[PDB]
Amino acid sequence: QVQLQESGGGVVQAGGSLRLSCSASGRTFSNYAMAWFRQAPGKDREFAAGINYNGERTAYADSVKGRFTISRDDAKNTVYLQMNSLKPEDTAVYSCAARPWSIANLAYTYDSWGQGTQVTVSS
Amino acid sequence: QVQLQESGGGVVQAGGSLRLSCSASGRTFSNYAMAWFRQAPGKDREFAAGINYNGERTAYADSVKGRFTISRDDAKNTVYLQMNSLKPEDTAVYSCAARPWSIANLAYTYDSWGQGTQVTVSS
Amino acid sequence: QVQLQESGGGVVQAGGSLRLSCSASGRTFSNYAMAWFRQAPGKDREFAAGINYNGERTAYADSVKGRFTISRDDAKNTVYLQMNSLKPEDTAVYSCAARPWSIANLAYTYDSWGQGTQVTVSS
Amino acid sequence: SIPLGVIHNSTLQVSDVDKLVCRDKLSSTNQLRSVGLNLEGNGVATDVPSATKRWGFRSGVPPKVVNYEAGEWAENCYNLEIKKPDGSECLPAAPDGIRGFPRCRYVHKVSGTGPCAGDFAFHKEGAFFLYDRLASTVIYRGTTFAEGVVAFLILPQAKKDFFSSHPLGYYSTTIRYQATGFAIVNAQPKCNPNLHYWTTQDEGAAIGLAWIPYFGPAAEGIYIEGLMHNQDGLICGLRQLANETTQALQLFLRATTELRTFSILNRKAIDFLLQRWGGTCHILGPDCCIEPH
Amino acid sequence: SIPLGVIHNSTLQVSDVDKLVCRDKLSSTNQLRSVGLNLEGNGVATDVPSATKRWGFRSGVPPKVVNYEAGEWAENCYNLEIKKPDGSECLPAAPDGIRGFPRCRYVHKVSGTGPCAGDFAFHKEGAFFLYDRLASTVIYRGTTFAEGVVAFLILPQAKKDFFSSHPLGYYSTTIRYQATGFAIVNAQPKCNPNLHYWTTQDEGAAIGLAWIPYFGPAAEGIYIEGLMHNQDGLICGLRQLANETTQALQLFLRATTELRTFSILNRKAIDFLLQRWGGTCHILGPDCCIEPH
Amino acid sequence: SIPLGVIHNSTLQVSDVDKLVCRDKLSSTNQLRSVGLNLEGNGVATDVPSATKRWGFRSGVPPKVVNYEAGEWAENCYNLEIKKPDGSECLPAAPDGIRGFPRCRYVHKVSGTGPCAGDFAFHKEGAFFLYDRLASTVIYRGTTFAEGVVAFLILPQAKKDFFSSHPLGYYSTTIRYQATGFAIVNAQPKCNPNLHYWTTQDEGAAIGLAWIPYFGPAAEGIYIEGLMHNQDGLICGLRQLANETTQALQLFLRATTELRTFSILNRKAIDFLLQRWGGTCHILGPDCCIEPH
Ligand SMILES: *[C@@H]1O[C@H](CO)[C@@H](O[C@@H]2O[C@H](CO)[C@@H](O[C@@H]3O[C@H](CO[C@H]4O[C@H](CO[C@@H]5O[C@H](CO)[C@@H](O)[C@H](O)[C@@H]5O)[C@@H](O)[C@H](O)[C@@H]4O[C@H]4O[C@H](CO)[C@@H](O)[C@H](O)[C@@H]4O)[C@@H](O)[C@H](O[C@H]4O[C@H](CO)[C@@H](O)[C@H](O)[C@@H]4O)[C@@H]3O)[C@H](O)[C@H]2NC(C)=O)[C@H](O)[C@H]1NC(C)=O
Ligand SMILES: *[C@@H]1O[C@H](CO)[C@@H](O[C@@H]2O[C@H](CO)[C@@H](O[C@H]3O[C@H](CO[C@H]4O[C@H](CO[C@H]5O[C@H](CO)[C@@H](O)[C@H](O)[C@@H]5O)[C@@H](O[C@H]5O[C@H](CO)[C@@H](O)[C@H](O)[C@@H]5O)[C@H](O)[C@@H]4O)[C@@H](O)[C@H](O[C@H]4O[C@H](CO)[C@@H](O)[C@H](O)[C@@H]4O)[C@@H]3O)[C@H](O)[C@H]2NC(C)=O)[C@H](O)[C@H]1NC(C)=O
Ligand SMILES: *[C@@H]1O[C@H](CO)[C@@H](O[C@@H]2O[C@H](CO)[C@@H](O[C@@H]3O[C@H](CO[C@H]4O[C@H](CO)[C@@H](O)[C@H](O[C@H]5O[C@H](CO)[C@@H](O)[C@H](O)[C@@H]5O)[C@@H]4O)[C@@H](O)[C@H](O[C@H]4O[C@H](CO)[C@@H](O)[C@H](O)[C@@H]4O)[C@@H]3O)[C@H](O)[C@H]2NC(C)=O)[C@H](O)[C@H]1NC(C)=O
């Protein structure tokens, strides 16, 4: 259950900033954890960021640690991914995932997936 | 078990007809099923035709269906294989086999085997 | 337990004679079996000769059978390996091993090992 | 020496690991599967008086058990509760891992008194008794079973539709009786042109923490169902192949000393690997089917 | 589908056996092991009143057992003797192969009555109960256990520095209670940087004549201890990986019909061999990742 | 680390699986065999008063068993029925899968009372007790056994021989007692120069619907016979090899946690395959035995 809908993708220059969104349906949003996955062209899906059901433990991948910040708003059933100091190797398809109270790295433990959005950064 | 003895092999022209025979010893012939196997040069033994302990069901291979007919005569302890519309790729060593009840395709399930006869057809 | 100390190695001409020794510490020497292992350059350790806890049965490898004799002296806590009619392929590092009452071929079943001595025979 | 059939383009051919399978692409053990087909699909009589005559008692032969991974819907199943005239039981109690055959349309419960000559009850025709993905050669007390035979297959490479969820509802009726004095061509009386199968879950069957055994389905909510009526030659060939492979399986079970055998397909894979890449083969040599270009 | 991790220069990277594992050397089966990490290193409460709330009773699911090879020292272990109000037992007697968890600091033995509404006691959070190199999904009567999870991984090819003897005896106390009315990134509440492990060592434990079972150590003298604290990223990575691999393992256990499973790593090795040299691998192609000269 | 021998031209060479099997052709698992050889062929005293002193009682060590596939005719076999002074049994009842030794000439039945310190009876010298293709380390109550050791072996390619049938009558007598107060070189005091073996028929056993368990032979009519008196060095070498390889097998058994072990040879084959086609082997090198032309 729980449908997801990402938005905010586009084309940005190198060193710029971008912010994504992911709105979830249903009324049990506060019981779910959200994570962001990105898939580089010709590469497999990989973990980017995450958050709990209460926003007290956020985990980041080593590649994006310190540049990306993730937050959630339980009153709007949305999560955000603020991107700063973008680099040419960050171009990928960013996907939104949902799973029950917790936080996980492997992609096969997640229940609901979004279709993803395209983020392309130009040198 | 029973002893088997084939006969009737020889040299025939393409499109001709040939008939084989297989006489079995013992006095329990009606309790056994008889099948014919052929082995092409440089090839493994394969199933050709068969019959039950009372006639009824007879099975044929796909390559020979419609051209070969198999019959048995319990009063003489013999089985026959009528061969019609012969073709050049029918050259093989035809072997006579017997097993208790039911016709089987795999060759390792049969109890008694004959020495086989040579059938070759000239183009 | 039990410490071993070889001696008597050196350089000898082909067809000469050489005698080795192996003194063992402790006071339970008569309860242990002793064997000699040799390691050719670029090869693995292999069995050469052995003896029981009371003499009696002695075992020799096929290569050295008839040329080597092994003996023990329980009053001196030493064993000896008399070598006669040496050949150029006998160049190796000869090691002394000890094990509980018995006699064995495989090297993994021995408990105490010595550092070994060098025997070189010149053509 | 147990025969196994390979499937390509919905066609069945019988071969073995020793025969060179090079176009036959065996890449993973997921392609190795064993299926147990019911004996009633061959046209045998299924009513109790005729079915009873196929089971007899013997003493001096230990029982053996082998598994199978996919089954088939059974129209008739049996459940025996017979006992000796003096009141002692005739059939041994089922072991811990044995459960009744799932997906039975009817269950015939047979109970009564009769002579019991031997220790165990065997099948007079050599077939097996199927107990929920565990085929046994003896009848256990009070456990539902269905007569059938087991066949071994090599599924086509990474197609994922064979034994899937409904490629192209379960109600059981109990009937009670009382008794006293208890390449391949199909060559059977009849062959069923439809195969309504069931198989164990394809692992992942959990979404909302349903993988936790506490918050999980019971022992009967695991299986996945399907239907394969499209092909007629393939499944009747499968039935005939399962008919033939019984002799080798039974002899192998006689030879072994394991109580339950789970490692036939693994041994087949090991044989295949040790055969084709055994060692010291040649680039032009046909023993190891390697394509230089 | 069970994930397995590959260790390289004290760095953990999870990757399935399919994912082109040829730059990662796998020479022998000695490189495959499973580790039974326990939950108390993740920051969970360990006192009896809060630990009891994680176990519940469920009827209709058969139990399963998994073998694991290496473990960890446990500060808290439990031992249940629950009875029904009328005096009947609630927990099944431990099978013959099950023994208490070794290397426990404290053993909280819980006794008393309570309502038992199921056949077996399961873990509400999906974890396992560890009994001396045999992880189980149910609680057995009177045997010491420590709740934890098990992970599979591929070791580097070396002198076996991992799980060796003290790289850098014990006393367990009695605490009795009476109750009524009974790159992977770590993302757990807390992770313990130090790993104080215990393991069994095949061979290399026989001096004099100690390999004889008669003149041998008891069942508690087999184990070889160690300690690993130099790196802390790898340890928390292993803990997080152990938490992640539980779902795939529980589903695999649900699918199988074997009471005790000892053949997961062998199946992984066979899968690897069948993937890589399965057939007609090309020299230039990256699928057959070999080198010319 | 269990040693295993390779036969070539009636010569025995001991070499572990990890190397020195390059010129040694392994093509299928049919070449892997395990043989159990009796101790009485080594010259040990065999009468009851001397054989009793070799068995002792210990408490605190769990028992383990191994299976072996070929055996040897035994001149003397034993059957114990010891009891405690109060009347309690000393020996555990045999498990379901354990049966007496197949081929014995004399069976010494020993029955009486004596002290029984431990829980199980072990062999003071490290050897095993053989029960019908199942070598245990403890004595079971009322089952015939012959004490011996087990060796693991690799056979010539096929040769349709070497444990064939009679290459070149059964009658056992009972003697009842009553007691109170209960290239490698052969190096044993004696080695029997004849090996009169028995082994289970290799799968293909019987014809004429004798493969059906209902009509098949009993549990003691499935063995074959043979004789290998022609060669003297090879079989004394085999006896010495078994005597040598008892230490590693016992250590491996103590390490493991399986009650019954059946998967040593399969693990050896997997290890061989992983060693020699592990990955990226050179076209011209000792590691990779594939050679051009
Ligand atoms: C794979 O698929 C195969 C093919 O589908 C299966 O093969 C079947 O194997 C069965 C077991 O071998 C086999 O059944 C046998 O049938 C033999 C035939 O003899 C009888 O033929 C009919 C049978 O009718 C019987 O009559 C009974 C009394 O009315 C009824 O209870 C019932 O209808 C019986 O089936 C009939 O004309 C006669 O009774 C005949 O028996 C006499 O005459 C025949 C003449 O040939 C002679 O052989 C007999 O000796 C009699 O004089 C039968 O012989 C078999 O055994 C019976 O007899 C033996 C001998 O005394 C005795 O020991 C048995 O206890 C028994 O009484 C046996 O019943 C069946 O025919 C095969 N199927 C077909 C269609 O060929 C495989 O089983 C399958 N594999 C697996 C693993 O499932
Ligand atoms: C593979 O093959 C190997 C070779 O065939 C086997 O090796 C055997 O190992 C066992 C176990 O280690 C050894 O057994 C015993 O060894 C000591 C021998 O001393 C004893 O026997 C001497 C002769 O008298 C005996 O006669 C017969 C036997 O012939 C016997 O029935 C009598 O009862 C009597 O004892 C004699 O020896 C004394 O003199 C020696 C010098 O000559 C001196 O070194 C020794 O110390 C003695 O003073 C004594 O009579 C003596 O009793 C024996 O002491 C060991 O027993 C002690 O230790 C045991 C283990 O700790 C313990 O159980 C026992 O109670 C004792 O405390 C030991 O049992 C065999 O000798 C040896 N065989 C050979 C030929 O050397 C392997 O077992 C095989 N492997 C397998 C089967 O897996
Ligand atoms: C891998 O690692 C992750 C992360 O650490 C582990 O995730 C944990 O999973 C478990 C089980 O899924 C989670 O437990 C659940 O927690 C939710 C959330 O409840 C919170 O808020 C409640 C208020 O509404 C509050 O009551 C809860 O408090 C409980 O615990 C405190 C002590 O911590 C205790 O004082 C209270 O009395 C409560 O008992 C809590 O703060 C909760 O709603 C869930 O309950 C549902 O399910 C239970 C049965 O499972 C049952 O009661 C009902 O069905 C109920 O609706 C449940 O308790 C836990 O929160 C996760 N931890 C984190 C930090 O995310 C994961 O388990 C690891 N894997 C493995 C295999 O261990």
PDB file of N, CA and C in Angstrom, chain D residues 43-68:
ATOM      1  N   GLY D  43      -5.627 -42.431 -15.460  1.00  0.00           N
ATOM      2  CA  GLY D  43      -6.842 -43.176 -15.700  1.00  0.00           C
ATOM      3  C   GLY D  43      -7.117 -44.329 -14.762  1.00  0.00           C
ATOM      4  N   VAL D  44      -6.372 -44.452 -13.663  1.00  0.00           N
ATOM      5  CA  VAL D  44      -6.601 -45.546 -12.731  1.00  0.00           C
ATOM      6  C   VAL D  44      -7.884 -45.304 -11.945  1.00  0.00           C
ATOM      7  N   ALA D  45      -8.485 -46.390 -11.466  1.00  0.00           N
ATOM      8  CA  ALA D  45      -9.689 -46.284 -10.654  1.00  0.00           C
ATOM      9  C   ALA D  45      -9.359 -45.686  -9.294  1.00  0.00           C
ATOM     10  N   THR D  46     -10.243 -44.815  -8.806  1.00  0.00           N
ATOM     11  CA  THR D  46      -9.984 -44.058  -7.592  1.00  0.00           C
ATOM     12  C   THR D  46     -10.915 -44.380  -6.433  1.00  0.00           C
ATOM     13  N   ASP D  47     -11.968 -45.163  -6.644  1.00  0.00           N
ATOM     14  CA  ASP D  47     -12.858 -45.487  -5.541  1.00  0.00           C
ATOM     15  C   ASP D  47     -12.161 -46.404  -4.537  1.00  0.00           C
ATOM     16  N   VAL D  48     -12.695 -46.417  -3.313  1.00  0.00           N
ATOM     17  CA  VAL D  48     -12.010 -47.095  -2.210  1.00  0.00           C
ATOM     18  C   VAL D  48     -11.826 -48.589  -2.453  1.00  0.00           C
ATOM     19  N   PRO D  49     -12.841 -49.352  -2.882  1.00  0.00           N
ATOM     20  CA  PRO D  49     -12.613 -50.797  -3.066  1.00  0.00           C
ATOM     21  C   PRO D  49     -11.502 -51.124  -4.050  1.00  0.00           C
ATOM     22  N   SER D  50     -11.375 -50.360  -5.136  1.00  0.00           N
ATOM     23  CA  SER D  50     -10.316 -50.633  -6.100  1.00  0.00           C
ATOM     24  C   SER D  50      -8.974 -50.091  -5.631  1.00  0.00           C
ATOM     25  N   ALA D  51      -8.977 -48.951  -4.940  1.00  0.00           N
ATOM     26  CA  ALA D  51      -7.723 -48.370  -4.476  1.00  0.00           C
ATOM     27  C   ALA D  51      -7.104 -49.188  -3.353  1.00  0.00           C
ATOM     28  N   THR D  52      -7.930 -49.850  -2.542  1.00  0.00           N
ATOM     29  CA  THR D  52      -7.411 -50.653  -1.441  1.00  0.00           C
ATOM     30  C   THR D  52      -6.565 -51.817  -1.943  1.00  0.00           C
ATOM     31  N   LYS D  53      -6.940 -52.408  -3.078  1.00  0.00           N
ATOM     32  CA  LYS D  53      -6.250 -53.585  -3.588  1.00  0.00           C
ATOM     33  C   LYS D  53      -4.809 -53.310  -3.994  1.00  0.00           C
ATOM     34  N   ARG D  54      -4.410 -52.049  -4.122  1.00  0.00           N
ATOM     35  CA  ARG D  54      -3.061 -51.710  -4.553  1.00  0.00           C
ATOM     36  C   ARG D  54      -2.080 -51.556  -3.400  1.00  0.00           C
ATOM     37  N   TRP D  55      -2.532 -51.682  -2.154  1.00  0.00           N
ATOM     38  CA  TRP D  55      -1.677 -51.526  -0.986  1.00  0.00           C
ATOM     39  C   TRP D  55      -1.615 -52.838  -0.218  1.00  0.00           C
ATOM     40  N   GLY D  56      -0.404 -53.241   0.163  1.00  0.00           N
ATOM     41  CA  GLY D  56      -0.215 -54.470   0.902  1.00  0.00           C
ATOM     42  C   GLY D  56       0.804 -54.280   2.006  1.00  0.00           C
ATOM     43  N   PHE D  57       0.838 -55.251   2.912  1.00  0.00           N
ATOM     44  CA  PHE D  57       1.680 -55.188   4.099  1.00  0.00           C
ATOM     45  C   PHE D  57       2.909 -56.073   3.937  1.00  0.00           C
ATOM     46  N   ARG D  58       4.048 -55.575   4.412  1.00  0.00           N
ATOM     47  CA  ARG D  58       5.302 -56.312   4.368  1.00  0.00           C
ATOM     48  C   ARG D  58       6.125 -55.961   5.599  1.00  0.00           C
ATOM     49  N   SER D  59       6.965 -56.906   6.016  1.00  0.00           N
ATOM     50  CA  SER D  59       7.896 -56.703   7.115  1.00  0.00           C
ATOM     51  C   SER D  59       9.298 -57.075   6.661  1.00  0.00           C
ATOM     52  N   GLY D  60      10.278 -56.271   7.067  1.00  0.00           N
ATOM     53  CA  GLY D  60      11.666 -56.512   6.727  1.00  0.00           C
ATOM     54  C   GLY D  60      12.283 -55.517   5.768  1.00  0.00           C
ATOM     55  N   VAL D  61      11.556 -54.484   5.361  1.00  0.00           N
ATOM     56  CA  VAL D  61      12.066 -53.457   4.464  1.00  0.00           C
ATOM     57  C   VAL D  61      11.916 -52.108   5.157  1.00  0.00           C
ATOM     58  N   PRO D  62      13.005 -51.386   5.429  1.00  0.00           N
ATOM     59  CA  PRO D  62      12.870 -50.081   6.069  1.00  0.00           C
ATOM     60  C   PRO D  62      12.262 -49.070   5.114  1.00  0.00           C
ATOM     61  N   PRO D  63      11.479 -48.123   5.620  1.00  0.00           N
ATOM     62  CA  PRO D  63      10.888 -47.106   4.748  1.00  0.00           C
ATOM     63  C   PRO D  63      11.870 -45.999   4.404  1.00  0.00           C
ATOM     64  N   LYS D  64      11.617 -45.353   3.268  1.00  0.00           N
ATOM     65  CA  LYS D  64      12.455 -44.270   2.776  1.00  0.00           C
ATOM     66  C   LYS D  64      11.578 -43.107   2.334  1.00  0.00           C
ATOM     67  N   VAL D  65      12.138 -41.899   2.394  1.00  0.00           N
ATOM     68  CA  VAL D  65      11.407 -40.675   2.092  1.00  0.00           C
ATOM     69  C   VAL D  65      12.262 -39.787   1.197  1.00  0.00           C
ATOM     70  N   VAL D  66      11.644 -39.235   0.151  1.00  0.00           N
ATOM     71  CA  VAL D  66      12.272 -38.261  -0.731  1.00  0.00           C
ATOM     72  C   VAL D  66      11.287 -37.114  -0.925  1.00  0.00           C
ATOM     73  N   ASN D  67      11.817 -35.931  -1.226  1.00  0.00           N
ATOM     74  CA  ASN D  67      10.992 -34.739  -1.353  1.00  0.00           C
ATOM     75  C   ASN D  67      10.684 -34.425  -2.812  1.00  0.00           C
ATOM     76  N   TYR D  68       9.701 -33.554  -3.002  1.00  0.00           N
ATOM     77  CA  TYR D  68       9.407 -32.944  -4.287  1.00  0.00           C
ATOM     78  C   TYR D  68       8.949 -31.514  -4.040  1.00  0.00           C
TER      79      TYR D  68
END
